[PDB]
Structure formats: structure tokens, C-alpha cells
Amino acid sequence: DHAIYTAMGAASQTLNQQAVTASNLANASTPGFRAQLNALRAVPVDGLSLATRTLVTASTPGADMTPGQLDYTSRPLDVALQQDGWLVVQAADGAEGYTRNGNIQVGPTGQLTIQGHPVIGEGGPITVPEGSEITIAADGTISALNPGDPPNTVAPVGRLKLVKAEGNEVQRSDDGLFRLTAEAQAERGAVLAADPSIRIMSGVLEGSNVKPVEAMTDMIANARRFEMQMKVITSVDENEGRANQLLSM
């Protein structure tokens, strides 16, 4: 009779996986979105005799660190990072989260903000003169020009800090912002170094790295597995109803 619960787990966990891919698959055309690859973990239930039951918990071993491909927007301060490079952003609470969205914006007061909770580079928040005409250089140096001054007055006004950290040492943190896995902190410290090898492209955005082929095959497999567990549940229940008749007379 307890077999049903094992099957039940799988079904529920399968639904959980579906949810993952859904939030994975709806986020196509999200700038810089990193897909959330999913897995199923076997959980043996070691006990007192003849361990036959194992449960089917679901999991997200992290995010897919595969760089999505680029849209040339020609916008002066759309920034695209090279592979395994991250923009640093002051998060909501105030902390260095990491992002791949280069859709930079400038507020009316001269504040450079990938979507609010702004950006961090070489100091605190990056602030630029109000008459922006901003350009972002190849290695991040931010140069500015007042729109009504001669072009030979474009001295740099800031620097855009970039960070190398990939995969096993990066963890999503309930926002679009990643952080360090608390295991890569008895390591390279809480606030990371600037890694003077991460390059930038201006005028290019990076899109979601959601491969639709693996998503589609994932959904197919999920549907089939769900309905297989459904058969197991039906058979077990019908067995139980069949067998409660030992006790009569």
C-alpha cells in the first residue's frame, strides 16, 4: 500500500520539474536570462529490512552557464559580456549580485542603473554627468560627453567592474541576481576582484540561453513519466480494494 506514495512522489516531483521548465521556457526573450537546468534525485529510504523503496525528489543543480547569443541593438550603452563574465550590481538589500543583463539605463539625475538596484564599478554606484551621451569602452571604461561641447572632451568618467565566476561557484538568489555559493567564499573573498581580462561589446545585448529542443524533449519525457506513475497508482489502489476483503466472515 505504501508503494503508492513512492509513485505519488514521482508525479508531484514531475509536476515540479514542469514548473521549472515553464519558468525556464516562458523567459525566452528575457535579456541575459540564465536557464535553470533541472534534475531528479533518487532518495533511498534505508530502514530495518529489505530496502525496496526509493523516492524521486526533484532538484535544480543550479543555472545553465551557456552564453546565449547576441542581438545587435546599436544602442551606445547596451553591453554584452564575454563568456563567464558578470556585471556587478548593488542588489535590493545592498550587496553585490551578478547579472548578464547589459541593458544599461541612465536616470535623469545621472545614475547608471541596470534595472533599478543600480550598478557597481570601481567604488560605489556608478554616477555620470546628467548630459549623458555615454559610451562604454571595450574593457568597461565609461566615457562621457556633454551634448553641446566639442568632441575632444570625452575624458573617462567611470569604470564598469566585471567579474569572472562560473557555474559551480555561482548560485541564483531568489532574484535575477546571482551570488557566490558560500563554498567559493572560503576562497576568493566576499567582494570579488575585477579580473582585468573580461571584455565588453557595446551596442550588443545577450538573450536567454534557453535551448528549446532540450526543453521540448524534457516536456515530452515529463508527460510520459507522469502518466506511467498514474498507472502504478491505479494498480496499487485497485489491489488495496481487492485485498481488504480478507477480513470478512
Binding site: A19, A26, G148, Q171, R172, A223, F226
Partner: protein, 260 residues
């Protein structure tokens, strides 16, 4: 209704909104001064369900926790403010802008709107208007029987009269610039209104303090790249189909579940 259904419907909503943005941005080719719109999406919060354990590093262990997350709410519709191409209209009372700036217009209700459009005219009293009669502030009153109207590169507008060998300077047509051009709140009729994301309007003559010059006889065209819109349309249709497949797969899962 289980979470997969609602997440996939957020995805379908997002693709529908993106298609609305594309369709508007497409239909407004041959709209003067129109600035292409780009839909920017953002993911919603992730609900951690089971925090990741300890990575003992004794073996290569998968870092499995479980956070699902949801939704694709549209976070912005950025107006891509760039200098569009010029087309000659041969109309004397017409003008385009060389660089940033907006003509200030007095709305019927009293406030000020701002337009990047030079399809100007004159009403029965000589006042400049904007294709719908909205007065261009400050008022410029053309004399009754002018031989010709000239609007210089810095807005100094003059008329030629019968007999005098001098273009009497009849008005000044000054521009308005914002510290954040993208933040203007579009209201229709080719009009933007200033909001907290754009800052106060800064008034100035063209060519000074960052305002762009003026080119008479020309109209700025929409900076819509139709090839981009077509490629985005293909992407939107495919993403819509994929999300519909997500909904359908979840639905047949549910059918089998409720069978027994």
C-alpha cells in the same frame, strides 16, 4: 490550477505584449519623428523550496537544492531615441531637428507636451500649430501677407514682405531638452509628457546647450528597422508556439491525473 499552467500563461502574455509592441512599432513607419519601442522583460521572484545542503567535496556532488520561480512580467518599453533620416517635404513651414530636442506644445488643458515632429501649419491667426492645431510655445505669429517664411538653423524665424529688402525677424523657435530622453511618457498624437524619470525640461535655443540645430523643409522619419521587426516577429511566433506546447503538455498530464 497548478503552477505550471499559470507560469506558461505568463509566458503567453509576454509574447502577446511583445507582439503588440512589434505591431505598433511596425504600423508607424511613415510617422514623422516616431521612435521605435523595444519590449524589455524581467523574470519574477524565485521561491526557494529546499535550500542546497553541504557540498562536502569528498566526492563530486551535484549541488541540488530546489527553487522553481515563476513568470515573465514585462518590466519596460524602452523608447529608442535616435536621429532618424530626413525626407524633403518642400514645405516652407516644415522643419526637422538635427540632434536632440523637442518642440514644446501647449495642450488644450493647459499643461505642456513635447513633440519631435515638424508637420507645422498656420491657423487663421498666424499662430504656428502642430497638425491638429496645438499651439507651439512660445507663440510665433506670422504676419498676414508674408511673401516667404524662413526658419533658420537656430530657430530665428523671419518673413519676407512686399517691398522691404530685409527679412524682419518675426519670432524665435526654441527647443527643449531633457536629461533623460528615454523617460518621456508618450500620450499619443506624437506627444510626450515629462515625468519623474525624465527630469525637468531645460529650454534653450537650438544649437546651444546641447540642443540640436533645425533643418527647414525636411521632416524626420521614423527610426524603425523593419528587418529587426520581422526577425523579432519570427522569434515571437516560435516562442508563443513553445509556450502553448508547455500548456498543452501540462493539460494532458492533468487529464491523465483526473482519469484516475
Amino acid at each position: 490550477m497548478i503552477s505550471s499552467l499559470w507560469i506558461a500563461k505568463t509566458g503567453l502574455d509576454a509574447q502577446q505584449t511583445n507582439m503588440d509592441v512589434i505591431a505598433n512599432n511596425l504600423a508607424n513607419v511613415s510617422t514623422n519623428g516616431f521612435k521605435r519601442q523595444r519590449a524589455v522583460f524581467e523574470d519574477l521572484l524565485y521561491q526557494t523550496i529546499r535550500q542546497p545542503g553541504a557540498q562536502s567535496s569528498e566526492q563530486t556532488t551535484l549541488p541540488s537544492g530546489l527553487q522553481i520561480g515563476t513568470g515573465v512580467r514585462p518590466v519596460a518599453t524602452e523608447r529608442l531615441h535616435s536621429q532618424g533620416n530626413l525626407s524633403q517635404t518642400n514645405n516652407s513651414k516644415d522643419v526637422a531637428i538635427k540632434g536632440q530636442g523637442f518642440f514644446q506644445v501647449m495642450l488644450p488643458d493647459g499643461t505642456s507636451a513635447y513633440t519631435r515632429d515638424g508637420s507645422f501649419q498656420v491657423d487663421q491667426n498666424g499662430q504656428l500649430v502642430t497638425a491638429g492645431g496645438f499651439q507651439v510655445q512660445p507663440a510665433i505669429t506670422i504676419p498676414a501677407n508674408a511673401l516667404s517664411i524662413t526658419i533658420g538653423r537656430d530657430g530665428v524665424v523671419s518673413v519676407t514682405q512686399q517691398g522691404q529688402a530685409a527679412p524682419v525677424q518675426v519670432g524665435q523657435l526654441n527647443l527643449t531638452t531633457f536629461m533623460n530622453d528615454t523617460g518621456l511618457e508618450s500620450i499619443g498624437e506624437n506627444l510626450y509628457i515629462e515625468t519623474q524619470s525624465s527630469g525637468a525640461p531645460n529650454e534653450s535655443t537650438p544649437g546651444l546647450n546641447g540642443a540640436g540645430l533645425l533643418y527647414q523643409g525636411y521632416v524626420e522619419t521614423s527610426n524603425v528597422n523593419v528587418a529587426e521587426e520581422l526577425v523579432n516577429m519570427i522569434q515571437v511566433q516560435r516562442a508563443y508556439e513553445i509556450n502553448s506546447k508547455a500548456v498543452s503538455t501540462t493539460d494532458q498530464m492533468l487529464q491523465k491525473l483526473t482519469q484516475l
